[PDB]
Design an enzyme around this catalytic site. Structure first.
Site, PDB file in Angstrom:
ATOM      1  N   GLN A   1       0.835  -1.190   0.000  1.00  0.00           N
ATOM      2  CA  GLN A   1       0.000   0.000   0.000  1.00  0.00           C
ATOM      3  C   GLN A   1       0.875   1.247   0.000  1.00  0.00           C
ATOM      4  OE1 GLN A   1      -2.890  -0.202   3.158  1.00  0.00           O
ATOM      5  NE2 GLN A   1      -3.703   1.839   2.708  1.00  0.00           N
TER       6      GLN A   1
ATOM      7  N   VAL B   1      -0.919  -3.133  -3.723  1.00  0.00           N
ATOM      8  CA  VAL B   1      -0.436  -4.315  -4.420  1.00  0.00           C
ATOM      9  C   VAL B   1      -1.043  -5.559  -3.788  1.00  0.00           C
ATOM     10  CG1 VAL B   1       1.544  -5.668  -5.110  1.00  0.00           C
ATOM     11  CG2 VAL B   1       1.732  -3.182  -4.940  1.00  0.00           C
TER      12      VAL B   1
ATOM     13  N   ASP C   1      14.462   5.330  -8.792  1.00  0.00           N
ATOM     14  CA  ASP C   1      14.074   4.973  -7.431  1.00  0.00           C
ATOM     15  C   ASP C   1      14.672   3.652  -6.950  1.00  0.00           C
ATOM     16  OD1 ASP C   1      12.903   5.123  -4.971  1.00  0.00           O
ATOM     17  OD2 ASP C   1      10.840   4.836  -5.698  1.00  0.00           O
TER      18      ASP C   1
HETATM   19  C1  PP2 Z   1       5.309  -4.059  -2.461  1.00  0.00           C
HETATM   20  C2  PP2 Z   1       5.406  -5.584  -2.515  1.00  0.00           C
HETATM   21  C3  PP2 Z   1       6.729  -6.026  -1.876  1.00  0.00           C
HETATM   22  C4  PP2 Z   1       4.237  -6.140  -1.708  1.00  0.00           C
HETATM   23  N1  PP2 Z   1       5.321  -6.058  -3.928  1.00  0.00           N
HETATM   24  N2  PP2 Z   1       5.157  -5.224  -5.043  1.00  0.00           N
HETATM   25  C5  PP2 Z   1       5.112  -5.913  -6.155  1.00  0.00           C
HETATM   26  C6  PP2 Z   1       4.925  -5.305  -7.496  1.00  0.00           C
HETATM   27  C7  PP2 Z   1       3.718  -5.574  -8.206  1.00  0.00           C
HETATM   28  C8  PP2 Z   1       3.485  -4.996  -9.462  1.00  0.00           C
HETATM   29  C9  PP2 Z   1       4.441  -4.141 -10.034  1.00  0.00           C
HETATM   30 CL1  PP2 Z   1       4.123  -3.428 -11.586  1.00  0.00          CL
HETATM   31  C10 PP2 Z   1       5.654  -3.862  -9.343  1.00  0.00           C
HETATM   32  C11 PP2 Z   1       5.901  -4.443  -8.069  1.00  0.00           C
HETATM   33  C12 PP2 Z   1       5.258  -7.334  -5.790  1.00  0.00           C
HETATM   34  C13 PP2 Z   1       5.303  -8.592  -6.484  1.00  0.00           C
HETATM   35  N3  PP2 Z   1       5.201  -8.654  -7.860  1.00  0.00           N
HETATM   36  N4  PP2 Z   1       5.450  -9.729  -5.761  1.00  0.00           N
HETATM   37  C14 PP2 Z   1       5.554  -9.705  -4.421  1.00  0.00           C
HETATM   38  N5  PP2 Z   1       5.525  -8.559  -3.730  1.00  0.00           N
HETATM   39  C15 PP2 Z   1       5.382  -7.363  -4.359  1.00  0.00           C
END
Ligand code: PP2
Length: 272
Positions: free
Chosen positions: A28, A34, A139
């Site tokens: 979040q 996400v 970033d």
């Molecule tokens: C923030 C967190 C660690 C929960 N996070 N964020 C993403 C993520 C999803 C879509 C995009 Cl486009 C970029 C990153 C993600 C992922 N794929 N798998 C596991 N954790 C994720």
């Protein structure tokens, strides 16, 4: 025998929102959340959503566009998208979460230099690919690196990627000069996160003190138990002139060969 050659102009990304199924909330931020879910009930996936009236739906989709053009084993892979609000971005799921939480979690305290340098190498490889594609991340940090099975590491969060002061190079934070080199500076800060189990950079220093300091030539000291040779690499990453900083191509090679070519006398310790 007889291949299909017609009707291929179809969008290889777009998909029906009905095929998605957000299950567990994993993240979040300011412009959305996400979630972990299933794509057609048979594919576990990650979905990045957007909070209505928090960012232009057109801008949000930008991170999706960049992800359509960039493909690499050390970059989080985009699977599908839903360009119509509610907008969704579907990607492979990284099982161990962000590199940051992994580092300060229970399974992080057992990590040692060989694994840590190897992860840096993976990240460097990803950035090397971005580097040769003429893109900039803007970033790069531990919170934006995802970890998967077998400790695979992948660069993620290209929300502000195109053709946070403690991680941002001076020229970038001051004059908006974001380049692959300001990204190399970030990797250097990331290297400190890796060698301290995810500690926040510049301990005990507020954001404004950090800018003053780095401008005055201040640079973080060598982390405890961290080989001086590795700190030297960090210092090369933080050179005042962006053009003095090494390329990710150089960093990837240096780190991959680290234990034989640079630190041949390396011996395990209490934390690294
Ligand atoms: C923030 C967190 C660690 C929960 N996070 N964020 C993403 C993520 C999803 C879509 C995009 Cl486009 C970029 C990153 C993600 C992922 N794929 N798998 C596991 N954790 C994720």
């Amino acid at each position: 025998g007889h291949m299909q050659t017609q009707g291929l102009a179809k969008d290889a990304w777009e998909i029906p929102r009905e095929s998605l199924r957000l299950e567990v909330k994993l993240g979040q931020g300011c412009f959305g959340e996400v979630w972990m879910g299933t794509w057609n009930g048979t594919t576990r996936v990650a979905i990045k959503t957007l909070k209505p009236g928090t960012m232009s739906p057109e801008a949000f989709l930008q991170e999706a566009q960049v992800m359509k053009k960039l493909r690499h084993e050390k970059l989080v892979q985009l699977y599908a998208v839903v360009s119509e609000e509610p907008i969704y971005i579907v990607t492979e799921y990284m099982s161990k979460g962000s590199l940051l939480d992994f580092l300060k979690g229970e399974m992080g305290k057992y990590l040692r230099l060989p694994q840590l340098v190897d992860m840096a190498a993976q990240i460097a490889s990803g950035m090397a690919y971005v580097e040769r594609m003429n893109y900039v991340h803007r970033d790069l940090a531990a919170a934006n690196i995802l970890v998967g099975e077998n400790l695979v590491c992948k660069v993620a969060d290209f929300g502000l990627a195109r053709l946070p002061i403690k991680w941002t190079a001076p020229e970038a934070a001051l004059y908006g000069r974001f380049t692959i080199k300001s990204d190399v500076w970030s990797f250097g800060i990331l290297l400190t996160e890796l060698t301290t189990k995810g500690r926040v950079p510049y301990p005990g220093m507020v954001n404004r003190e950090v800018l003053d300091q780095v401008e005055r030539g201040y640079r973080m000291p060598c982390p405890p138990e961290c080989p001086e040779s590795l700190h030297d690499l960090m210092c090369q990453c933080w050179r005042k002139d962006p053009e003095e900083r090494p390329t990710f191509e150089y960093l990837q090679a240096f780190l991959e060969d680290y234990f034989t070519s640079t630190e041949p006398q390396y011996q395990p310790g209490e934390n690294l």
